Amino acid sequence: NSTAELEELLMQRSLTDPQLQAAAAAAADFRILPDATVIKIGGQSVIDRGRAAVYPLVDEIVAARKNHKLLIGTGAGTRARHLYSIAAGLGLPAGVLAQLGSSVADQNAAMLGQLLAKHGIPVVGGAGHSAVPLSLAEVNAVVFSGMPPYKLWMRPAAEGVIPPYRTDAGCFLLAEQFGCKQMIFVKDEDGLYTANPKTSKDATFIPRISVDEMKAKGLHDSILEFPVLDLLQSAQHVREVQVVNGLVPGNLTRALAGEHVGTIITAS
Amino acid sequence: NSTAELEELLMQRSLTDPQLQAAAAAAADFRILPDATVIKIGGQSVIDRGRAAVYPLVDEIVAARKNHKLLIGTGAGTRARHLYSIAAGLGLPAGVLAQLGSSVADQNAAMLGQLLAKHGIPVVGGAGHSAVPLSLAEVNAVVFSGMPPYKLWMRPAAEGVIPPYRTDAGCFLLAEQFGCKQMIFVKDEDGLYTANPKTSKDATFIPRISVDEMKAKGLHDSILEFPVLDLLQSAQHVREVQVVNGLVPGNLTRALAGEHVGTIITAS
Amino acid sequence: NSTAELEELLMQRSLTDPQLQAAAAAAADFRILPDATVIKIGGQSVIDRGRAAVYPLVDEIVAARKNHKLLIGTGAGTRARHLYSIAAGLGLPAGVLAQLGSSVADQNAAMLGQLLAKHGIPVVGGAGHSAVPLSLAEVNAVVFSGMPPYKLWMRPAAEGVIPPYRTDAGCFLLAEQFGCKQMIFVKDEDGLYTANPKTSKDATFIPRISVDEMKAKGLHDSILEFPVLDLLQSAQHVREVQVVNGLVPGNLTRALAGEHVGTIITAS
Amino acid sequence: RPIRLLPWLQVVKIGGRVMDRGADAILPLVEELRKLLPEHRLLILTGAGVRARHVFSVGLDLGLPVGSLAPLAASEAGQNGHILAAMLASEGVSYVEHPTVADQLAIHLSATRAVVGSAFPPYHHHEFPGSRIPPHRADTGAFLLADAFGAAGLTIVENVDGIYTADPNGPDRGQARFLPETSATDLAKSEGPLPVDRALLDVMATARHIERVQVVNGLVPGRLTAALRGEHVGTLIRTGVRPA
Amino acid sequence: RPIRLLPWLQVVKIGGRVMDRGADAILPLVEELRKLLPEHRLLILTGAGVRARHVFSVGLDLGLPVGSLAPLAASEAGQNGHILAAMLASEGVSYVEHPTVADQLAIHLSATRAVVGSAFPPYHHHEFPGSRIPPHRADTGAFLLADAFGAAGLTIVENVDGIYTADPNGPDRGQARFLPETSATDLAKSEGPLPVDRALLDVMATARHIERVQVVNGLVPGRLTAALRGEHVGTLIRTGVRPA
């Protein structure tokens, strides 16, 4: 390869051209925020539960940002499900529902951000405005709404009008495109089980699994949005994710310290 | 009370329902910026006077932010009065005048902010973007325009089209909703007198007074916008305010140090 | 002079009145960011060259902001020339081309900003949002797009539709209006020569020259946009500029250290 | 008194709880709105409904003050507006943001027959203290706008026939008597729940133009149409602005 | 030369000092504008007037540079625009912001017969140095826009009959002679005050389309109407663009 050959292809071929695609794949790989960790705080699993769930995680965030740069994205939760149900019953398309869901994740970011404001932690659009916060020991963290910006250009699912890329996908893609070192999904279960632990009696805990193994076990759409598992196999920078129970005091702190709490899902 | 009963009422009653209103009143009380002080810099009383008034207060702000977190809101002043007079003579409504007045407070915030820029102090929308500035010893203060955001939805006064909620009210409501520890109005008189000291010969200084006492003395609309006194009696967090003379060197500094300069007006 | 006489003229004369103009000229002179240096990173001369040019300058920016407050503006480069050619061939006016060129400088600021994000350095509108960054040792620098905001109100050149005020002018005017101590143009030549060193064999290096001397030598439109030289003679705060070769490792660092690398162009 | 900015405007506030009923309520209302577009120039403003109760539940549990809850509720009214506008998009109807409603409504109603916006006012973190529930909600914002504009009317579209002497869906349901007509001052002197914000009564007291606001049942097709023609099909609220 | 983007457009700049006179001047002008809406497609741009002098007084006392004063003055022109648009709202007229004027004016003039904007250009902190008074003000911004668009005309609506040889309200009032017609180059060679920005003359020298700009007295009803029909009722400024 060479820059000259890449620029030649870039000028003279369609971007669809396999030869161009391959030359572009050999480009150097810059990580924009390599030392940051992206954390998703679940909407339904955490923020909808109010103080008993949110206040301990606020404390952990405040303690953790002493030693860890944090990009904290919020899920949407039950109010988004309500909007999806109204809009779906009207026949509205996935692109319209996508905008509705974003407003609920924004609400959750605003509530979490107000609990963190006195600790110096702002609510921002995304990682592109986190540069100053993440360079300051006094700050070292930001809060953002986790919904992707696709709005009316949301790709629909194969079936139904529920946007397939929601806040798990939004947070994952931010960690991936900013080349972050770690992606932690904070939910309300200890991790992945062989069945939904809420509706199954004897589901077995899975500490570590690959995407292929999840698909083969029927877990494609279990504790993460299924599109996320496919994004993870495509990712250049974040090749595994960790799912932890935010309802367990200190679980996020211990995950940031490298403890294998929860479930590690690997691209391969 | 209980969260479950509150959520029951929230789902099944009108928000107007006294039972719901009462259950909501028992909710816990979070202060968003409990350690910050809101300071209003008068438009007519200070900024319109130019350098002799503004430069000493700039020095005090710079010195004060070493030990105090500051949210500094600007008044509007004579250009807003001019716009109000033009618009009122055209028969325009209070909601239109409200937008006009906001632009003048914005001008004043921009001028003050440019004098503070080299000291690290930014101009922001309001307290919702002050999180990072107020966590930094190098900064620890922000400047904002003091006009409330009501614009065309301004509630009119009982009589006339002058917006009743202007920059005193805007700054007070920000201190109140962010749960700040202190609200200081910086004007051009030492405090409240028994009569307008500019147009009365032998007005007597009042170091401390309640809102009820002010109303009973005919001072309802004297050194603060009268709506502010009613807001103060309704407030959850800021139950007194201090009015000081910004034209006296060091008066703001001494007020921040707990000195009883000026007049303390108490909700009760 | 006196403030009272100035305010008298301001109320009663046209702003065109020579007497008003003269009284306004006697006003005190405040420098908003007196300790900052504005640096323009050339679009065609640096950023269009990719990593070999940009990465060493990124390193220098990171090292330099340890001891220097930096406002770093980006040029536009070849994609703007392409847009200008398309639009000019359509007969579009300079005001339309101005908006097109701004988008290219924005792209360049975004690319540079992403390389600096992990060092804490944000991309901002301009100097009016640099207050917090420039007060922090951890930051002490910002990146901005260098194009002036004139858009459709761009003054056209005497001839042709190429906007005459582009990113050299935009960066210069920012340094001037914020009263910065220094303006450094980072290009791809060691400085000014007696002829275009790319197309002339035996051009001679010029270490120091005034604007009048440049005009007399036929160099009015050489290594800087010609409007910049006229702006420089009108400037109140930045009365000289330095042009340096960003392709020479350490040249920017040495220029910030007071070394006379490159060419110093003086208003007089 | 102030001039009327948009004297030909009709403002219609759609209750959030009407929207909450989904297609069963929204589709008939959309068809009725469709038929109204050639007859009136409409500003259609949506309330918030049940989702704002949920975010109040969370926010109050987190201890957040009333100025934090106000924009959280307003968001829900905006979402309802986006939904309703989408249903009318083929008629040229779009949702417009608050600054657009405030400064550019005249041009937008020149472009198209109706626009949709949020009925909540942008009080934001400058909501008044006192109650932990934001007082200036959808009815109040819609009235403030309609009266500021000097609009020809404000019609409030409810999930009930109008105002009763008790909550007709609540514990005292049995003694709830329908009020065909009332004054804002009479309503303000009563304690007990209403289908309209208490702050609506306060802003009616300082109103400059709107003399009456009708609350009608949007679940009954034709009542909005009749109300916009001044037919008495719900509860008339007299504001205390006097006619000439 | 560049194509004309909006060749059918008429641009009217309303002096800030006309607006400063309040209802006595504004109401007749509003009635005249009303009657013009069916005749012309209008971009109506307002200047700043006396409030910008006050903010210059404060800002200069604070030592602020000319790039700080430019947006402070532009704000006042925007406020005048909001006031004037409010008076025309019932005709479908709204104030539009600078980015909207720059990129979406065609669609807005398709929606409605006229829009109002600020005549100041968005030079902001990139105003040119030299004078401590922002040079690119309302006349200049309005001309830059009108010429960039290739508009059919720019009419400047003043509080005086046109340009005189001396300030007709100033100390040399007595020797002030009315100029029915002048060239920008002749005006630029003269020292002394003008009712138009000196920078207007500079941008006229580089103009591509507008051949003449008439300054007329907006305090005389009918002069704006006559000027928009090319009748000579004030001072004609020839820009030095030549006709075909």
Add this chain to the structure above:
Amino acid sequence: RPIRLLPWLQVVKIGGRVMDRGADAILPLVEELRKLLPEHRLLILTGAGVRARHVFSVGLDLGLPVGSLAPLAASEAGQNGHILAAMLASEGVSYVEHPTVADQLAIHLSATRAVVGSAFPPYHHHEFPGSRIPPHRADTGAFLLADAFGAAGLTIVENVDGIYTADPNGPDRGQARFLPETSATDLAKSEGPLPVDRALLDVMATARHIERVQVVNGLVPGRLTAALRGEHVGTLIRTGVRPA
């Protein structure tokens, strides 16, 4: 299936490489668009073309990830849109930003016969990983929008007659055979370059409304006009949405 938001809309995507040809291609296309305005309600979306290749060259040399390159390319499509809208400004046509297209398109198409926007979707730094080239580009964004709206059609205006079995301007030019008609699924199973994004084929597979998209040569006057009337003048791509 979802309702059609704007069933009367015609969406036309103009290839960035068509715009790259400058006046020689743009002026005839502008004249053809002019004549189409009274016949159709048009959303005209521009692609990016060669300047996005240049910024990809720089950004990839700098090592930037695909989510960094996506908005950099989208900028170029926006610039093409601003250029094309300027040429149609005298017809009332303006460029509208993405949030405006997303939420207010109905009112803008009520104000005027056509608007121009960027065909790129706002995936921004949330572009999908895998390729170092942003996958969701102009064809893909235009289709996503057209199908989300339930538009009557999407016509893709190319610098070639349609899709061939090989790049008709590339090394295998000689064996390139024209395809008058194809299915998205057939195209997706083939390796090799296409004149349309590969992601277009993916979003066609999940489409709800658009049954066919025609790729036509915008360098041949009249083909866009014919295509908007359903005449077969380029390559028809069947999406796999079935008709009733």
